[PDB]
Design an enzyme around this catalytic site. Structure first.
Site, PDB file in Angstrom:
ATOM      1  N   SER A  51      -3.801  -8.998   5.248  1.00 12.74           N
ATOM      2  CA  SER A  51      -3.032  -7.390   4.738  1.00 12.74           C
ATOM      3  C   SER A  51      -2.652  -6.811   6.783  1.00 12.74           C
ATOM      4  CB  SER A  51      -3.026  -7.031   4.279  1.00 12.74           C
ATOM      5  OG  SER A  51      -4.131  -5.949   3.922  1.00 12.74           O
ATOM      6  N   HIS A  52      -3.918  -6.559   7.517  1.00 15.05           N
ATOM      7  CA  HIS A  52      -4.712  -5.630   8.341  1.00 15.05           C
ATOM      8  C   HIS A  52      -5.109  -6.445   9.271  1.00 15.05           C
ATOM      9  CE1 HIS A  52      -2.630  -3.274   5.197  1.00 15.05           C
ATOM     10  NE2 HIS A  52      -3.018  -1.646   6.036  1.00 15.05           N
TER      11      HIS A  52
ATOM     12  N   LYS B  11       4.693  -5.539   3.513  1.00 14.68           N
ATOM     13  CA  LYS B  11       4.505  -6.452   4.058  1.00 14.68           C
ATOM     14  C   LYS B  11       4.611  -7.870   3.976  1.00 14.68           C
ATOM     15  CE  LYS B  11       0.851  -8.100   7.791  1.00 14.68           C
ATOM     16  NZ  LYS B  11      -0.328  -7.566   8.444  1.00 14.68           N
TER      17      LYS B  11
ATOM     18  N   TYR C 157       5.917  -3.526  10.781  1.00 17.78           N
ATOM     19  CA  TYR C 157       4.131  -2.775  10.039  1.00 17.78           C
ATOM     20  C   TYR C 157       3.682  -2.706  11.314  1.00 17.78           C
ATOM     21  CZ  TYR C 157       2.140  -2.358   6.131  1.00 17.78           C
ATOM     22  OH  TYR C 157       1.811  -1.407   5.165  1.00 17.78           O
TER      23      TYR C 157
ATOM     24  N   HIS D   6       2.077  -4.912  13.403  1.00 14.43           N
ATOM     25  CA  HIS D   6       1.228  -6.181  13.273  1.00 14.43           C
ATOM     26  C   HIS D   6       1.902  -7.705  13.732  1.00 14.43           C
ATOM     27  CE1 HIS D   6      -0.911  -4.012   9.420  1.00 14.43           C
ATOM     28  NE2 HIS D   6      -0.849  -3.099  10.159  1.00 14.43           N
TER      29      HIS D   6
ATOM     30  N   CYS E  22       0.552  -0.710  -0.348  1.00 12.27           N
ATOM     31  CA  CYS E  22      -0.122  -0.513   0.071  1.00 12.27           C
ATOM     32  C   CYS E  22       1.264   1.218  -0.081  1.00 12.27           C
ATOM     33  CB  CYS E  22      -0.283  -0.150   0.823  1.00 12.27           C
ATOM     34  SG  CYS E  22      -0.014   0.147   2.606  1.00 12.27           S
TER      35      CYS E  22
HETATM   36  C1  LIG Z   1       0.518   2.736  14.492  1.00 12.94           C
HETATM   37  C2  LIG Z   1       0.010   1.391  14.372  1.00 12.94           C
HETATM   38  C3  LIG Z   1      -0.260   1.331  12.853  1.00 12.94           C
HETATM   39  C4  LIG Z   1      -1.443  -0.138  13.197  1.00 12.94           C
HETATM   40  N1  LIG Z   1      -2.401   0.166  11.530  1.00 12.94           N
HETATM   41  C5  LIG Z   1      -2.981  -0.862  11.665  1.00 12.94           C
HETATM   42  C6  LIG Z   1      -4.213  -0.426  10.228  1.00 12.94           C
HETATM   43  O1  LIG Z   1      -4.266   0.735   9.642  1.00 12.94           O
HETATM   44  N2  LIG Z   1      -5.164  -2.010   9.972  1.00 12.94           N
HETATM   45  C7  LIG Z   1      -5.186  -2.588  10.562  1.00 12.94           C
HETATM   46  O2  LIG Z   1      -5.832  -3.537  10.691  1.00 12.94           O
HETATM   47  N3  LIG Z   1      -3.567  -2.461  11.877  1.00 12.94           N
HETATM   48  C8  LIG Z   1      -2.922  -2.122  12.444  1.00 12.94           C
HETATM   49  N4  LIG Z   1      -2.550  -2.110  13.232  1.00 12.94           N
HETATM   50  C9  LIG Z   1      -2.468  -3.631  14.187  1.00 12.94           C
HETATM   51  C10 LIG Z   1      -4.038  -3.715  14.754  1.00 12.94           C
HETATM   52  O3  LIG Z   1      -4.368  -1.732  15.395  1.00 12.94           O
HETATM   53  C11 LIG Z   1      -3.139  -4.385  16.003  1.00 12.94           C
HETATM   54  O4  LIG Z   1      -3.133  -5.372  16.025  1.00 12.94           O
HETATM   55  C12 LIG Z   1      -4.451  -4.515  17.209  1.00 12.94           C
HETATM   56  O5  LIG Z   1      -5.193  -3.383  17.603  1.00 12.94           O
HETATM   57  C13 LIG Z   1      -4.061  -5.044  18.411  1.00 12.94           C
HETATM   58  O6  LIG Z   1      -5.320  -5.205  18.891  1.00 12.94           O
HETATM   59  P1  LIG Z   1      -5.231  -6.353  20.569  1.00 12.94           P
HETATM   60  O7  LIG Z   1      -7.043  -6.619  21.319  1.00 12.94           O
HETATM   61  O8  LIG Z   1      -4.736  -7.691  20.157  1.00 12.94           O
HETATM   62  O9  LIG Z   1      -4.803  -5.147  21.453  1.00 12.94           O
HETATM   63  P2  LIG Z   1      -4.914  -3.590  21.942  1.00 12.94           P
HETATM   64  O10 LIG Z   1      -5.832  -3.135  20.945  1.00 12.94           O
HETATM   65  O11 LIG Z   1      -3.366  -2.965  21.949  1.00 12.94           O
HETATM   66  O12 LIG Z   1      -5.452  -4.003  23.254  1.00 12.94           O
HETATM   67  C14 LIG Z   1      -5.111  -4.458  24.271  1.00 12.94           C
HETATM   68  C15 LIG Z   1      -5.661  -3.265  25.111  1.00 12.94           C
HETATM   69  O13 LIG Z   1      -4.794  -3.988  26.965  1.00 12.94           O
HETATM   70  C16 LIG Z   1      -3.986  -2.297  27.375  1.00 12.94           C
HETATM   71  N5  LIG Z   1      -3.549  -3.375  28.345  1.00 12.94           N
HETATM   72  C17 LIG Z   1      -1.769  -4.136  28.272  1.00 12.94           C
HETATM   73  N6  LIG Z   1      -1.790  -4.266  29.535  1.00 12.94           N
HETATM   74  C18 LIG Z   1      -2.767  -4.563  30.691  1.00 12.94           C
HETATM   75  C19 LIG Z   1      -2.613  -4.423  31.805  1.00 12.94           C
HETATM   76  N7  LIG Z   1      -1.859  -4.427  32.459  1.00 12.94           N
HETATM   77  N8  LIG Z   1      -3.754  -3.940  32.571  1.00 12.94           N
HETATM   78  C20 LIG Z   1      -4.859  -3.321  31.929  1.00 12.94           C
HETATM   79  N9  LIG Z   1      -4.445  -2.851  30.818  1.00 12.94           N
HETATM   80  C21 LIG Z   1      -3.577  -3.363  29.979  1.00 12.94           C
HETATM   81  C22 LIG Z   1      -4.012  -1.948  26.388  1.00 12.94           C
HETATM   82  O14 LIG Z   1      -3.341  -0.717  27.055  1.00 12.94           O
HETATM   83  C23 LIG Z   1      -4.316  -1.872  25.660  1.00 12.94           C
HETATM   84  O15 LIG Z   1      -5.070  -0.665  25.353  1.00 12.94           O
HETATM   85  C24 LIG Z   1      -1.297  -0.924  13.966  1.00 12.94           C
HETATM   86  C25 LIG Z   1      -0.361  -0.821  14.727  1.00 12.94           C
HETATM   87  C26 LIG Z   1       0.295   0.358  15.154  1.00 12.94           C
HETATM   88  C27 LIG Z   1       1.036   0.044  16.866  1.00 12.94           C
END
Ligand SMILES: Cc1cc2nc3c(=O)[nH]c(=O)nc-3n(C[C@H](O)[C@H](O)[C@H](O)COP(=O)(O)OP(=O)(O)OC[C@H]3O[C@@H](n4cnc5c(N)ncnc54)[C@H](O)[C@@H]3O)c2cc1C
Ligand SMILES: *[C@@H]1O[C@H](CO)[C@@H](O[C@@H]2O[C@H](CO)[C@@H](O[C@@H]3O[C@H](CO)[C@@H](O)[C@H](O[C@@H]4O[C@H](CO)[C@@H](O)[C@H](O)[C@@H]4O)[C@@H]3O)[C@H](O)[C@H]2NC(C)=O)[C@H](O[C@@H]2O[C@@H](C)[C@@H](O)[C@@H](O)[C@@H]2O)[C@H]1NC(C)=O
Ligand SMILES: *[C@@H]1O[C@H](CO)[C@@H](O[C@@H]2O[C@H](CO)[C@@H](O[C@@H]3O[C@H](CO[C@H]4O[C@H](CO)[C@@H](O)[C@H](O)[C@@H]4O)[C@@H](O)[C@H](O)[C@@H]3O)[C@H](O)[C@H]2NC(C)=O)[C@H](O[C@@H]2O[C@@H](C)[C@@H](O)[C@@H](O)[C@@H]2O)[C@H]1NC(C)=O
Ligand SMILES: *[C@@H]1O[C@H](CO)[C@@H](O[C@H]2O[C@H](CO)[C@@H](O)[C@H](O)[C@H]2NC(C)=O)[C@H](O)[C@H]1NC(C)=O
Ligand SMILES: *[C@@H]1O[C@H](CO)[C@@H](O)[C@H](O)[C@H]1NC(C)=O
Length: 521
Positions: free
Chosen positions: A496-497, A361, A457, A459, A328
């Site tokens: 991809s995302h 990616k 990336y 991810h 992308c």
């Molecule tokens: C800069 C960036 C850009 C991205 N761009 C994209 C995109 O455009 N499209 C896409 O599909 N994916 C994208 N991703 C990836 C995607 O956003 C993540 O893979 C996804 O949000 C991860 O979900 P999760 O529920 O595993 O974790 P998270 O959403 O991180 O959630 C975990 C939560 O647990 C909390 N937490 C952690 N430890 C503790 C604790 N001990 N006590 C209490 N709370 C705690 C954290 O603060 C957080 O809110 C991107 C990631 C980043 C960093």
């Protein structure tokens, strides 16, 4: 799909600061981490039971710039003071990275790209999926926070380049991860307003769901052996005061703290490799060899071009999908403060004009590393993580093919107007950073490029895999009333995302739990 609207903060009615929560509470379900998977999981369970979500970060309202597309880079540029929504970290490989630290999780700071998972990945996942439920869940999420994007000049230019470069077929507008070029959905609406996982909390029951922010969960509490059972968690508020939240009969503690946060909490709670935990004097609740193992981070390789004639900033919507790599382009304004994690290190040149970021990616990835504690007692200290980029040569081969494809895009008629000089091949562009090898047939040169210019990336996933730590129902094996639901559960990226899959996963498991409770009534 949803219709453009303001970010829905109706859930604020049941959101409390940890300092205002009871010192000792009782609920049916306690969810650690109000993130991408955590929020929809909590909302779903709240449809029938009493749920408490504990998030270490602040409400999105505390950091206004996480609510607009124009604020994406801004959040990454902000200094990490330990409270900001973007937590910075550097892998042992030396690659800068970031993770969310706010209600809504990383979905609140990401690039907004939305895609449904590759429909072919469910069979080899280790989970027997109810596909009707999977799609119903995708629709539930999409009808709330996913939008068909407006056309954008630079994204359209990128689309023409992808098609000219053979990334076929053309899928038009589609949410599905399929080989070829397409315009996918976004969690940013047509006015640039960001929508995220926190809004899925509005789908829950306002009388059964309670959200705690600024709540640092430090440990999972367990019953005596044998027949180990999670009984609750201990969390600390901003005043340093510890609170406890327990789960009632048939209830469960679900960890959705992310790829980094989940393994960390499990280890701190005594669930992990026996010898490792004992070496740190952490009591062993149950020896679990794979907690923190199999951490994967898809490498990102790229080319930054500085067009002689200015281009406008855009949100990513056009994807060029190949079987071994996903691509992308992102266009942005210039800046003097670098967005942490965008470039692999702080020693990178800054753009003083508009530029386009062509990213690639690698699928998978096949390479993986592990997560270890930096502090044996403080959950607020980031864990050490190593991803071992390109340790698996097949990943490298895919990077080479991917960057050669980028080379093709740079050689298209479509991108010719963005060169500063008429030079042939991939030459003629004003490049910001490491340029591609001139010879598109020099594999060795591309391997060197891939290795020396790699970035994350963002991810990353894994660390608490189904089949290694969890069973097919996401239960931590050997322990009752404990599950893990977030990005730490699978070794390979779903598309991809990944946010689409992780958002779906939260509610999916939530429904599976409700169906299990219904059968047990
Ligand atoms: C800069 C960036 C850009 C991205 N761009 C994209 C995109 O455009 N499209 C896409 O599909 N994916 C994208 N991703 C990836 C995607 O956003 C993540 O893979 C996804 O949000 C991860 O979900 P999760 O529920 O595993 O974790 P998270 O959403 O991180 O959630 C975990 C939560 O647990 C909390 N937490 C952690 N430890 C503790 C604790 N001990 N006590 C209490 N709370 C705690 C954290 O603060 C957080 O809110 C991107 C990631 C980043 C960093
Ligand atoms: C980089 O990633 C690639 C892709 O994952 C790795 O290559 C794969 O390595 C696997 C071994 O870890 C191979 O699986 C085995 O294949 C053989 C042959 O078919 C099969 O007999 C094995 O099955 C065994 O017996 C039962 C099946 O009857 C089974 O139930 C058992 O559990 C047991 O596994 C097993 O499936 C893959 O075939 C292989 N894929 C490819 C396309 O090559 C690669 O691993 C390295 O290279 C391999 C070729 C192999 O030499 C392996 O030992 C190496 O580690 C990864 N590279 C690195 C550096 O890790
Ligand atoms: C769960 O949701 C997924 C999507 O996330 C469903 O899969 C989709 O199903 C629809 C309807 O069957 C498919 O739409 C038809 O697609 C064909 C072919 O399109 C392809 O080729 C053209 C070129 O001719 C391209 O332009 C397209 O971009 C695409 O590559 C088209 O001719 C028809 O007019 C329809 O548009 C869609 O392709 C498919 N997507 C994917 C990624 O699979 C899934 O549905 C199940 O699986 C499909 C393949 C069918 O077998 C359905 O009958 C199944 O139900 C759905 N699963 C469940 C359980 O509902
Ligand atoms: C979608 O998922 C499938 C399954 O994980 C991916 O793998 C398939 O395609 C590979 C590339 O040709 C083949 O080598 C694999 O054998 C095949 N796997 C199976 C079991 O079907 C596929 O590449 C993914 N597609 C995209 C566009 O990412
Ligand atoms: C800004 O762009 C000019 C091109 O005229 C380039 O020479 C210079 O190195 C750039 N400065 C920075 C800090 O990027």
């Amino acid at each position: 799909l949803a219709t453009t609207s303001d970010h829905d903060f109706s859930y604020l009615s049941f959101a409390y600061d940890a300092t205002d929560l009871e010192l000792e509470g009782s609920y049916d379900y306690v969810i650690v981490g109000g993130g991408t998977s955590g929020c929809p999981l909590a909302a779903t369970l709240s449809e029938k039971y009493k749920v408490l979500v504990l998030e270490r970060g602040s409400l999105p309202t505390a950091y206004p710039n996480v609510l607009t597309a124009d604020g994406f880079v801004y959040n990454l540029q902000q200094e990490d003071d330990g409270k900001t929504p973007v937590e910075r970290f550097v892998s042992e490989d030396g690659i800068d990275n970031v993770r969310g630290r706010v209600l809504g999780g990383t979905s609140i700071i990401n690039a907004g790209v939305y895609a449904r998972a590759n429909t072919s990945i469910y069979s080899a996942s280790g989970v027997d999926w109810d596909m009707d439920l999977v799609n119903q869940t995708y629709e539930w999420v999409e009808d709330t926070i996913v939008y068909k994007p407006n056309s954008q000049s630079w994204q359209s230019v990128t689309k023409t380049a992808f098609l000219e470069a053979g990334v076929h077929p053309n899928h038009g507008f589609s949410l599905d991860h399929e080989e070829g070029t397409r315009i996918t959905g976004s969690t940013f609406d047509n006015k640039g307003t960001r929508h995220a996982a926190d809004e899925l909390l509005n789908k829950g029951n306002s009388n059964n769901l309670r959200v705690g922010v600024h709540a640092s969960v430090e440990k999972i509490i367990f019953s005596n052996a044998p027949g180990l059972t999670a009984t609750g968690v201990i969390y600390r508020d901003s005043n340093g005061t510890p609170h406890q939240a327990f789960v009632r009969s048939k209830g469960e503690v679900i960890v959705s703290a992310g790829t980094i946060g989940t393994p960390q909490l499990l280890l701190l709670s005594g669930v992990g490799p026996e010898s490792y935990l004992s070496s740190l004097n952490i009591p062993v609740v149950l020896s679990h060899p794979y907690v923190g193992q199999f951490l994967h981070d898809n490498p990102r390789n790229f080319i930054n071009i500085l067009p002689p004639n200015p281009i406008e900033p855009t949100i990513v919507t056009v994807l060029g999908i190949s079987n071994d790599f996903y691509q992308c382009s992102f266009s942005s304004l210039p800046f003097t403060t670098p967005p942490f994690g965008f470039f692999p290190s702080s020693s990178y040149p800054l753009p003083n004009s508009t530029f386009a970021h062509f990213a690639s990616k690698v699928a998978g990835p096949l390479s993986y590393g592990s997560l270890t504690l930096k502090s044996s007692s403080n959950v607020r200290v980031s864990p050490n993580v190593k991803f071992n980029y390109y340790s698996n040569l097949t990943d490298l081969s895919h990077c080479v093919s991917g960057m050669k494809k980028i080379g093709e895009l740079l050689s298209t008629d479509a991108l010719k107007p963005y060169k500063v000089e008429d030079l042939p091949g991939v030459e003629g562009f004003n490049i910001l950073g490491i340029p591609l090898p001139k010879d598109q047939t020099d594999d060795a040169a591309f391997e060197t490029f891939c290795r020396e210019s790699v970035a994350s990336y963002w991810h990353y996933h894994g660390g608490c895999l189904v089949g290694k730590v969890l069973d097919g129902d996401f239960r931590v094996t050997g322990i009752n009333a404990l599950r893990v639901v977030d990005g730490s559960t699978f070794p390979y990226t779903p598309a991809s995302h990944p946010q689409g899959f992780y958002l779906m996963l939260g509610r999916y498991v939530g429904i599976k739990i409700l169906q299990e409770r219904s059968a047990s009534d």
